[PDB]
């Protein structure tokens, strides 16, 4: 069942997006943004991502042990990279429209991963379902951020 | 050659490539203190674009083989820290944090190369220029750190 080398490798890989969160805190810029009613409080985000880093690593560990797992892991690498990209674009460069491009691509690769993961191992795909829900929420949130604050210069 | 695989990896490379097209070296990079052996800015896009193709071809080869899990897990890891680095160095402009990131990148680039050799020799060979380049980047990043140690970028 449990391969600790794989798991600790995928976990370590989450250390890159985890770092973007830890270096780019929400400050006053993010405060004064018009946000949608359903916008979760600050503390929700670190919690959610921390869980998902563990859930997706565990997922990728199961899959990586199976044969024919190349396309799935290629989808996985892709998802992780655009996930690492999103926070430095939204909070770092503060380009909400661009970040929305990024997060939508993130979404497609999260989805492609989930699918490819289901076709090899049902629990692995199951482990990515809460990932796909949070990614959708995030995209919605990125979208409302862009639209409700369109006339500011950070919406580009 | 497996086109589905290759294009997937090349698309993954779109994430670090975006970082670099969006954070083009301007006045700040120009006025940074840099070693004599710092290359002209036009080298950087050429080198990375080459390596995106090379690393994706390498990943295509490996991912077609039985037992590639761990190798591909190294690959996801190096790719992620690759993507983290340019926003830390150029965006945030934090030279010492950038050094830490690039050193972690280099480790995973070396582990990937290593794991690639254990499966597919040409996949390993393809990761050799990537590793040479990662070493030079680490050197460049180290030098910029110490040469600007007394400026706010020593962060
Ligand atoms: C469906 C798509 C299939 C795949 C086809 C699309 C591939 C997207 C990326 C390819 C890399 C090509 C090189 C892009 C140019 C990068 C130049 C750049 O500025 O790099 C910055 C540097 O890498 C920062 O560290
Ligand atoms: C997004 C970009 C990130 C990557 C950027 C960091 C990597 C650059 C380090 C390469 C060292 C090259 C070795 C030295 C090459 C010969 C010396 C030379 O460049 O001299 C310049 C000449 O004076 C003028 O034409
Ligand atoms: C062989 C390799 C062995 C390596 C040994 C294992 C190292 C694992 C380290 C990272 C854990 C990452 C878990 C996440 C912890 C912090 C999450 C976080 O802070 O990120 C939230 C951010 O807001 C979102 O963008
Ligand atoms: C004084 C010479 C410049 C000091 C550089 C010291 C250095 O090694 O910084 C490490 C960096 O913070 C990564 O941990
Ligand atoms: C291949 C295995 C990779 C597995 C994952 C690797 C984990 C490395 C563990 C510790 C890194 C600690 C390095 C910390 C670097 C110092 C950061 C620094 O720059 O601190 C300055 C800051 O600005 C102060 O204000």
From Swiss-Prot, chain A:
GO biological process: tetrapyrrole metabolic process
Membrane topology: Multi-pass membrane protein
Top-rank taxon, per record: Bacteria
Listed GO MF terms: identical protein binding; lipid binding; tetrapyrrole binding
Chief place where the protein resides: membrane
UniProt induction comment: Up-regulated during photosynthetic growth, when compared to aerobic growth in the dark (at protein level).
Locations listed in the record: Membrane; Cell inner membrane
Listed result of changing residue 14 to S: Leads to decreased levels of the protein and increased levels of carotenoids and bacteriochlorophylls
Keywords assigned by UniProt, alphabetized: Cell inner membrane, Cell membrane, Lipid-binding, Membrane, Transmembrane, Transmembrane helix, Transport
Reported phenotype of the disruption mutant: No effect on chemoheterotrophic growth, and no defects in the production of photosynthetic pigments. When oxygen levels are reduced during chemoheterotrophic growth, mutant cells respond more rapidly than wild-type and display faster accumulation of carotenoids and bacteriochlorophylls.
GO cellular component term, pick one: plasma membrane
Record note on what altering residue 43 to F does: Increased levels of carotenoids and bacteriochlorophylls
Pfam families in the cross-refs: TspO_MBR
Ranges annotated as spanning the membrane: 4-24, 43-64, 72-92, 96-118, 123-143
Subunit structure: Homodimer.
Family: Belongs to the TspO/BZRP family.
Function: May play a role in the transmembrane transport of tetrapyrroles and similar compounds, and thereby contribute to the regulation of tetrapyrrole biosynthesis. Binds tetrapyrroles and promotes the photooxidative degradation of protoporphyrin IX. Binds protoporphyrin IX, hemin, and coproporphyrin III, but does not bind delta-aminolevulinic acid. Can bind bilirubin, curcumin, gossypol, retinoic acid, cholesterol and the benzodiazepine receptor agonist PK-11195 (in vitro). Plays a role in the response to low oxygen levels and in the regulation of the biosynthesis of photosynthetic pigments.
Name of the molecule in the record: Tryptophan-rich sensory protein
Provenance organism: Cereibacter sphaeroides
């Amino acid at each position: 069942n449990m391969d600790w080398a794989l798991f600790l490798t995928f976990l370590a890989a989450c250390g890159a997006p985890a770092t973007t969160g830890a270096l780019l805190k929400p400050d006053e810029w993010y405060d004064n943004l018009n946000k949608p009613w359903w916008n979760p409080p600050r503390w929700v985000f670190p919690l959610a991502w921390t869980s998902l880093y563990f859930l997706m690593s565990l997922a990728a560990m199961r899959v990586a042990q199976l044969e024919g797992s190349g396309q799935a892991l290629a989808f996985y690498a892709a998802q992780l990279a655009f996930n690492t990209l999103w926070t430095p674009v939204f909070f770092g460069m503060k380009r909400m429209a661009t970040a929305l491009a990024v997060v939508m691509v993130m979404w497609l690769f999260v989805a492609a991963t989930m699918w490819a993961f289901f076709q090899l191992d049902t629990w692995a795909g199951v482990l990515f379902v809460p990932y796909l829900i949070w990614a959708t929420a995030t995209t919605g949130l990125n979208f409302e951020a862009m639209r409700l604050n369109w006339n500011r210069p950070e919406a580009r």
